[PDB]
């Protein structure tokens, strides 16, 4: 009965860019989700399966932990049925989603004086992302008839852009870390309970 390493996702020093969102697989451990739900240091804690207090009394075959950084505006987009640059080209929740979406403001950590350019997001994509897909390609979007041939140009743009987080930014433009916990139950014995 080992403890689920929830600390190593939540309290991790370095967080990923939404376009290359990290996934950690949780298994063969017990986790108290109720301490997480009552922390109040999370600005966002919406659940789409069952209430956070009730799943403490629920088992699961696997818990996947997806982590990334976005803007305040874009948090609402981390939800099923949501449209937007994040939800369409970066990370899309399915409509059958049965998990929780958690976030907190990381202005203190992730915003820097002249703009932090490490965090990226995908500005152009030909098609909307399927749920739980990850695209990390760096192919040049072709936005016009002129073929791109792999060279940045006119109507040929490198497909990723950067939030330039400044601590002076308004709230909506401030970085938010996000952890998405998806609870899966298969034809296999459960390994994650409370």
């Amino acid at each position, epitope marked *: 009965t080992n403890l689920c390493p929830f600390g190593e996702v939540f309290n991790a020093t370095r967080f990923a860019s939404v376009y290359a969102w990290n996934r950690k697989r949780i298994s063969n451990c017990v986790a108290d989700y109720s301490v997480l739900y009552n922390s109040a240091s999370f600005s966002t804690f919406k659940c789409y399966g069952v209430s956070p207090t009730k799943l403490n009394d629920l088992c699961f075959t696997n818990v996947y932990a997806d982590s990334f950084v976005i803007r305040g505006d874009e948090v609402r987009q981390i939800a099923p049925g949501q449209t937007g640059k994040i939800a369409d080209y970066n990370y899309k929740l399915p409509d059958d989603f049965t998990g929780c979406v958690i976030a907190w403001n990381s202005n203190n950590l992730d915003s820097k004086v002249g703009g*932090n350019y490490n965090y990226l997001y995908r500005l152009f994509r030909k098609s909307n992302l399927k749920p739980f897909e990850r695209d990390i390609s*760096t192919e040049i979007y072709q936005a016009g008839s002129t073929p791109c041939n792999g060279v940045e140009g006119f109507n040929c743009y490198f497909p990723l852009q950067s939030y330039g987080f400044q601590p002076t930014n308004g709230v909506g433009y401030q970085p938010y870390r996000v952890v998405v916990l998806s609870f899966e139950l298969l034809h296999a014995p459960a390994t994650v309970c409370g």
Partner: antibody
Amino acid sequence: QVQLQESGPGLVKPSETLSLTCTVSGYSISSGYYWGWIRQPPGKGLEWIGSIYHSGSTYYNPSLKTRVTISVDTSKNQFSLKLSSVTAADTAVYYCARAVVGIVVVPAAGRRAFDIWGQGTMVTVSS
Amino acid sequence: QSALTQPPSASGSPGQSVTISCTGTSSDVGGYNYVSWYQQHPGKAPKLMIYEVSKRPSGVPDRFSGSKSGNTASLTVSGLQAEDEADYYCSSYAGSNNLVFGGGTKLTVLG
């Protein structure tokens, strides 16, 4: 507003190691961008040496690859240059500069344009 | 000696317009749009005039402008003044080889 400043030994003995450092201020090197070294022999053309971003990744000019190391120390917020086996062809004004683009994954990152430049420190190689 | 070939000198008369060319190969200039022009006055650090072929940094006069066709880049100075008398260097990415420079071109104002 960002400022770059080169410092280092004015003189170097032939076949020994040239060691200059560049101290950034006004912007944490770790926060973004590529950062490069470019040199100009007296009365001769610009030469690009190498660039680096905060992870430690480096790109170098093929003709000086075997002799060049560029390092980053983020805690002191500076980057440095060592060039070994110096000859008189290394007598030059050595500039440090910052790139135009803050994104570190753009095509040809650190090998495009340099926006902010230092004053330049000169190194003469002589006995 | 320089993998980008740039005319050793160039000149124009005050009020007029002068153009400096910069020829490489399909693997540098012809290959990518990362072509950069710098202006260096004697005894002073280089200054960026033009990046990404035609893009002007802030504070750079509109009189300056750059372009490219095929293997050859151009920097055109309009309304030539005395303060423009300097050396100009061009630059471009080279794939395997990285960030190659031109030999430079001295521009005289001819007054």
